[PDB]
Design a protein around this ligand. Sequence first.
Ligand SMILES: Nc1ncnc2c1ncn2[C@@H]1O[C@H](COP(=O)(O)OP(=O)(O)OP(=O)(O)OP(=O)(O)OP(=O)(O)OP(=O)(O)OP(=O)(O)O)[C@@H](O)[C@H]1O
Length: 124
Amino acid sequence: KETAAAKFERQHMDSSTSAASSSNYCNQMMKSRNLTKDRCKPVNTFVHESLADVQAVCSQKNVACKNGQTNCYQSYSTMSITDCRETGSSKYPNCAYKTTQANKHIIVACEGNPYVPVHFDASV
Ligand SMILES: Nc1ncnc2c1ncn2[C@@H]1O[C@H](COP(=O)(O)OP(=O)(O)OP(=O)(O)OP(=O)(O)OP(=O)(O)OP(=O)(O)OP(=O)(O)O)[C@@H](O)[C@H]1O
């Protein structure tokens, strides 16, 4: 079975310098990572950093999670990311996304042993 940690990698890791794609990055990535299979995932962030760099955030700045848990962590450095937001015309199963590239601090929730990211909470 896919662990929460593996799911975080499938949903959010895109190790590279920045978004690269032959067509609309978000439409191709949301499809290829199976984020459009059971619904159109409405918002999603891809992180263009090494897996070690993202995992290291779990020992960086402790912040409250949007859901009130306290196992969220904000990166000290800005990171290269791409946000995918479903369009107003998007309707499952014909999902469609707008692509926003950014350099922002990421906030992830971490869990488990080893303590690793399992949920992407926000970017600031
Ligand atoms: N330590 C944590 N702190 C906060 N939330 C956490 C933590 N661990 C797991 N979660 C889970 O996050 C899921 C979304 O919950 P909530 O956010 O509280 O409700 P929502 O109404 O907002 O859902 P939505 O559909 O609108 O937006 P999602 O697309 O994010 O949902 P889903 O993909 O299924 O979530 P994930 O797998 O984690 O992807 P991702 O890493 O977040 O991208 C939900 O299962 C929570 O239990």
